[PDB]
Amino acid sequence: GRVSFLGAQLPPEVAAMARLLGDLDRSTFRKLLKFVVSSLQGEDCREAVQRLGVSANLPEEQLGALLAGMHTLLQQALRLPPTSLKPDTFRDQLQELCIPQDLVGDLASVVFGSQRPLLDSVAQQQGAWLPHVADFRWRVDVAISTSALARSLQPSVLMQLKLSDGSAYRFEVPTAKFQELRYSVALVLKEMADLEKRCERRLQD
Amino acid sequence: MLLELSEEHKEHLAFLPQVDSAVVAEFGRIAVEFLRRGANPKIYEGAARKLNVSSDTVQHGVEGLTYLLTESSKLMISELDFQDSVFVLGFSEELNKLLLQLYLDNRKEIRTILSELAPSLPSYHNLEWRLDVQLASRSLRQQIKPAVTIKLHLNQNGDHNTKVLQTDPATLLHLVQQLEQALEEMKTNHCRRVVRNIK
Amino acid sequence: MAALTAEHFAALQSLLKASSKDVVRQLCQESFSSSALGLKKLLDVTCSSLSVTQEEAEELLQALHRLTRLVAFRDLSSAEAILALFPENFHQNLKNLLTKIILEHVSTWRTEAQANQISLPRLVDLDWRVDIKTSSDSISRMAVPTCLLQMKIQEDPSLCGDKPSISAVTVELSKETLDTMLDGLGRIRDQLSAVASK
Amino acid sequence: MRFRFCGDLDCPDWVLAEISTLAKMSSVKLRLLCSQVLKELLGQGIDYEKILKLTADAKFESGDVKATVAVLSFILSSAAKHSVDGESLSSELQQLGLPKEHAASLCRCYEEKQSPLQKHLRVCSLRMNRLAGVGWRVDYTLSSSLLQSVEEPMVHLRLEVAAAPGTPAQPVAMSLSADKFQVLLAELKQAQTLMSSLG
Amino acid sequence: LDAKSDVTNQLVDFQWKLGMAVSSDTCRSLKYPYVAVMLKVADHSGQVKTKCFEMTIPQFQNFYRQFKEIAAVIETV
Amino acid sequence: EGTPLWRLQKLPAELGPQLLHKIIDGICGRAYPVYQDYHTVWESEEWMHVLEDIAKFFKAIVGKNLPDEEIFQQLNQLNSLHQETIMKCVKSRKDEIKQALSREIVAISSAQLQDFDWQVKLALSSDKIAALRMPLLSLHLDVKENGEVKPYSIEMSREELQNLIQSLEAANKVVLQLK
Amino acid sequence: MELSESVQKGFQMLADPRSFDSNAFTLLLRAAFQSLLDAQADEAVLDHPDLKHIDPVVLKHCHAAAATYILEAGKHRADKSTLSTYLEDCKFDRERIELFCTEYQNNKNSLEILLGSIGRSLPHITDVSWRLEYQIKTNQLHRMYRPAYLVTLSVQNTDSPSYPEISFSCSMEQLQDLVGKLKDASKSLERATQL
Amino acid sequence: MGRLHCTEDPVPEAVGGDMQQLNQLGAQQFSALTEVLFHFLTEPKEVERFLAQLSEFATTNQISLGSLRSIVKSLLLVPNGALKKSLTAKQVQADFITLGLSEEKATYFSEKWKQNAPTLARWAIGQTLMINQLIDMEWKFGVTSGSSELEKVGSIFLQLKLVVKKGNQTENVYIELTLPQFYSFLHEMERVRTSMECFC
Amino acid sequence: MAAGELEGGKPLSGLLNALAQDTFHGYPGITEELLRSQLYPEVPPEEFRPFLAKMRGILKSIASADMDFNQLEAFLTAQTKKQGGITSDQAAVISKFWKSHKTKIRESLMNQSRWNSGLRGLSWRVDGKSQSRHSAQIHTPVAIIELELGKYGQESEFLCLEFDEVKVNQILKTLSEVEESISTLIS
Amino acid sequence: AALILRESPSMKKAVSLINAIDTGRFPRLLTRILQKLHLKAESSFSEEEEEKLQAAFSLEKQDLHLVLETISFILEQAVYHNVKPAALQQQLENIHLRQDKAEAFVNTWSSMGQETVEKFRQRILAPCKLETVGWQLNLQMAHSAQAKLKSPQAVLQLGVNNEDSKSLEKVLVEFSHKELFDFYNKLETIQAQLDSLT
């Protein structure tokens, strides 16, 4: 079924935008749209917003209202997959927001053009929260002899780890604990495979 | 799923069928206490010497019984799965009933113990706040600058920790709106589908 | 172990765009050698040398990293060992050039992998001075030997942070302590001699 | 619509529910529980065996005594925070549906403790550390390698900085020249003279 | 020449101050005379560093006497 | 043999006053001279050596506060143009060097306050009470220790500020006896 | 407004047509304002011939006096009445008083922006991010089947521009409690306006 | 008093009075006091033991603790100076006779000094300055079989742990050497040894 | 009220000593309940406490003030003549206490006034150099030095140093400049 | 045979004391010592156990310390040479241990020597070592910038000890299945190297 892309009600920011843009110069709107899309891509723009504002004779509060409402609207539209937010539902819901059709078409050019898969590839980057492995390395040795023991021949594995936050660690582990680690990893991999194959089917039912 | 015993765990339990059922029940009570208080080998010594048995055998027996109670509380197998487990262990219906009673009366408490072995993630404890207005400063002696002062309380590993923070009102309204949207996303249909079907 | 792919081979075929074989040598040694910090520079070197895009440079450097690390890891140091990796459609005029290049560098790559492998803090220099204590705050006259020993020790910046922070340690040994330590050290000699005699 | 004791909001669903658990106690036992909760808000604590023996004959579970202590401490904090009076408390409680004698039993407790409790809540408001004390030494310098005669005073200051009453303070210890000391004194006197106009 | 001295620390400079405490919040007449010394030091770790300490006149005089003993010994040895 | 100014003798006297003044400003903690203005006169090693030697000389001369006859005798090595240049550079501003030296004497201690700021707030309300209406001060201190500056912050009620003011006044009633 | 003798003596000389013509005085004010607000300011600010004909000691002393008075007037939010009163006490004429007060008014807001930039403040929250997950199984417990939230606040160190994150986890009850106390903290502003 | 070897400074007359008190105390009392003093000299850090044994002496002899500590210090003066100057027993006995200890009792204390001075001297030398003194060392040989870069490896190495004294603190230093660096380390340590044997 | 009856010389001297030990020497084992149960076991806490506190306040007022015996006699005259004052016997014992304990307290106040790190001690040896990897002989001795330092109530810092004969001479000259300053100022 | 055990006056004193003590209780205490021998951080007995040991032996404190130290040194040499019981018996006979104590010694050695040898064999010298492993498995459902997610995530914890800090650490990591498969392939290559070492 259809879903309201804004959620259960319009936030006051997007209402304030919609009441402001009703006669804005499309060139300035296109510039603001480029800025918003660039800032969603990770860039920064305070000097370009400023020189546009002074060029457009736009007050700081009007630029702020415009930018905030367009960012909220496009962020909410990206949150849904584009198959669910089918373009008829998008255009109709923006028409209920009373956006002028030229600006509806301009927003659709953001939500459905080649910028879409790039933004999707950026949105996935929020999902970590806990750092992933950066790299892993090892050395495996035989002691042969030791201060306590004329001979030993026990193996040991030295291991070293770095994490995507810049943390790094080095530790050595005996063979029994290495076998426990290897078993635990294989177990969790099996459980993850089974869980994925269950969910992927049961959510079709 | 069935809690199929290892051959070592079979050999461990195979001691108890020789013990008097009242003493198997006593070993059950001791084991299900040891699940929470921790073990005490003087009990193994005393019970074995009363049985005229070697203390290692009683130790192996009691700890096998503790492992049975742990794994059954981890899995939360059904009554009939536990019955099938003790039947394939080959215990008599006296001991099957005893073990089932020991299980069903305590598996919840064991789980309230075993949950502590999950890895420690930092988590929220409390929030404190203060609305205050800056009115002067050494360089500029009349002004009006409102802010919401905040103190955040957290814990990790059972510790206590705090953070001191500040926000403006517009940001605070944005925080409220976003965290309200976090709660709305548990009422939407997809998450309710997961929560029901992936049970 | 990590291995080549069809897209790595397609990227490798970009390497014939080199203006001179010295570019091939450089990009091989760098992509074997480079850290993730070095790749940022090596990408621009590859683009400047081959006119490739940054993405094509990234795919080429990834392919060369995978290839050279695989070769070092298995010790594929012979023509009969290396030449079978490349697919039957690969550029044979690249096949021979890259083979002979690899077979020349692999000895260096093999040699330096024994340094790049991980270690505890490594000794890099040592110094010592022996002196006689003659007087003190407590005994007006004395005469006994002492050794001052010094070591300079490196740590891995991977753990040490921005710098390997080469740092110094000194130790003082009395004669009984030195004789005990050598009644250690010599045991290593004797046991190694026994193992060689075994 | 709205409840004044909830700060012009609607009452939380858990409060409107758990006040019915309060309604299941007797009025005198509710009075005693309210008094013990007021002691808890005044920081005297509470004890599980007390609230049990006050309630276990009414078949209260541990969860029920815990929840009734929670709801009482909530409602009496909210009452004191908005400084709303016992007659208004009794009215909003009757609108929630607490029995007449139970509401009067709460009001007879709250009407005594409200002023002490509001004072305590004013003291217990959030603070960005506190100045526990000050120490100083004044010295005079005669000569140095850098100036064979100096003839100048110097001051040492220590601030004992703490988080909360009874927390161990840490000494911020520093040395000042007599000029910076006198400038600091004058600036602090200005800030005090300003602040005394605002209070 | 080689850094045979590097096995031990070296004093870069010696600076001194003579003064008197006069009072504290605990005592109106804390007439304690003292010498304060600042030592600036460089070391095998790199970066020049400094230490400060304060000692009473009898302790200073004992320190000075001990350096006189060190001088007398290194002259005698 | 000669005093550390022996290195100065080569400088053209028409360039001396600017160099010596800007180095004295460096002693006062102001900007030191830029090397570019003098790289034709000294190599960078000799440049840092003059930056040490001149400061050491001026500090030594003013620290013993010697009379100008003893200064002049202590300048028998200098050329007459440099003698007069250095003599005017001392007598014209020795007091800035003396204030810098007494500031360095205060640095013979374990920690020092570099600078401070103060701010006054009104707290309107809290999660504890809706009418807190409490005046507050924050004092911010920047204290040098171990070769770095630490930020500190001390909030105060009116009562805490009064106790601090009274104890500072008690200290000032002593400082006024000595200064 | 309490001021040092050096300041009032400087203004008592700035008062006098013989020390400075009223145009020279106005140019010296312009020089003072530039010497405060421009980071590239330098002694070249005194190079104008209406300035260079004054004794350099008097010129530099009165420049510093003017700049100090401008700073104090900004700090205490001086106005045309108090300015005119002080200038009358300094025996300025009406035209030089008006020329001062008009040039102060012309520069006042840049000086307001300058002065309010001073001093530290607490780390300021900039954004929030959240993730929602279902906990299913763990090292010992295979039946967890419960929701949890993973939350992050982005913040700036306002004292030293740098951007740490604070991250924590919430069960749904903890998230509802956090939301409820942030809502109360927001309604605080409405209740304070209507208090 | 006459000139003393144990002290260059004059000595209070209370020390002379205490020495006459050593003549007043009985032979068993003087012997027990001497044992208490040598116990304090050899193990002064066992302050609780010293206090216990001197309180026992006090209650045994009805001697007040102030007088006991006085006569202790007055008699420890000579052993203390003898340890400072490394005096002979003859000089110690002459100083005792000069302070006022009767010749027989000074001879007894001289013999108790003779039988203790070497271990006391060794203990006192143990109190002098040592910098980063080695407490202990551990070592482990080994052959490396593999790494993330090489499936098979021939490198051979030595690891050492050195334990180091840093005032009241201690430290562990971990280091790894190649085989040629082990050979050069042992060669340099033999060059140290022969240089140490030149003078030990 | 018992405050007028706690006059017993032995227990009162014990109490006064223990209060001085607690307040100034920092003895941790001394407490109100211990003092009461040893020295005045029948006096109830509500009547021992006010006198205990007031006499501690008197002792602090004396100890903090460097009272000479005339100022002390005046203060004790006030504390006896005022209503609820101490007795003449309490003043007499306070006088004899100050007359027998002044210097130890004042010394403890001086010792307590720590601010700068203290010199806890100095240790040194002089070694004659010999064989080294640098040269088969080395022709000079050196002093090896270490100061021990630290703030009050903290673990000791240690600072070790090496000086040659030239450094030793320079340090001796520097210290002689300090001694000559001190002697000039005290002369 | 080569010398196994040092002969000296301190050992002669200690064995003279050992011969004076009974043979009955001695092997139990030596077994507890032997059980503790591989532990550096604690004494083999509590202060009250050491007190009751001294009361049973009646020895003065330093004589008991000489006894316990020399039996510790005896067991360290027995470990180091992995001594055969009969060889230890002959060695103790050359020390002039009483024959019944030599029997009690070699019976004690037979009771625990291989176990203590193995406890020495597994000791790790590195300044840090791994202790424990645990894991958590979740399904991701939505986040602040995407919804209708189905991604499983596994958090991994590695429990570790630092012997320089003498404290725990708990490293935390995430894997998106892809990294967990890669990490497993690396761990299986480590296993292949540990097998090929055999």
Numbering used by the authors:
A (entry chain E): 20 to 224
B (entry chain B), D (entry chain D): 1 to 199
C (entry chain I): 1 to 198
E (entry chain F): 9 to 85
F (entry chain H): 5 to 183
G (entry chain C): 1 to 195
H (entry chain G): 1 to 200
I (entry chain A): 1 to 187
What does the published report state?
The Commander complex is required for endosomal recycling of diverse transmembrane cargos and is mutated in Ritscher-Schinzel syndrome. It comprises two sub-assemblies: Retriever composed of VPS35L, VPS26C, and VPS29; and the CCC complex which contains twelve subunits: COMMD1-COMMD10 and the coiled-coil domain-containing (CCDC) proteins CCDC22 and CCDC93. The COMMD proteins form a distinctive hetero-decameric ring stabilized by extensive interactions with CCDC22 and CCDC93. These adopt a coiled-coil structure that connects the CCC and Retriever assemblies and recruits a 16th subunit, DENND10, to form the complete Commander complex.
To examine the role of CCDC22 and CCDC93 in COMMD interactions and assembly of the CCC complex, we cloned all ten human COMMD proteins and CCDC22 and CCDC93 into a single biGBac construct for insect cell expression. StrepTactin-affinity isolation revealed that CCDC93-Strep and all other proteins were enriched in the desthiobiotin eluate, with size-exclusion chromatography revealing a single homogeneous peak. Purified BS3-crosslinked CCC dodecameric complex was vitrified on graphene-oxide coated grids for single particle cryoEM. Data processing in CryoSPARC yielded a 3D reconstruction (overall resolution 3.1 Å). The central ring of the COMM domains was more clearly resolved than the peripheral HN domains due to their relative flexibility. The human COMMD proteins assemble into a remarkable hetero-decameric closed ring. The ten COMMD proteins assemble into a remarkable and unique structure, forming a hetero-decameric ring from five specific heterodimers, with a precise and evolutionarily conserved subunit organization. Many specific interactions between adjacent subunits determine the precise COMMD organization. Although there are many individual requirements for precise COMMD interactions, in general the β1-β2 loop within the COMM domain of each COMMD subunit docks closely into a complementary pocket formed by the HN domain and linker of its cognate dimeric partner, and these interactions involve a strictly conserved tryptophan within the C-terminal α7-helix of the neighboring subunit. One functional implication of the COMMD assembly is that the HN domains are positioned peripherally and appear to be primed for mediating specific intermolecular interactions.
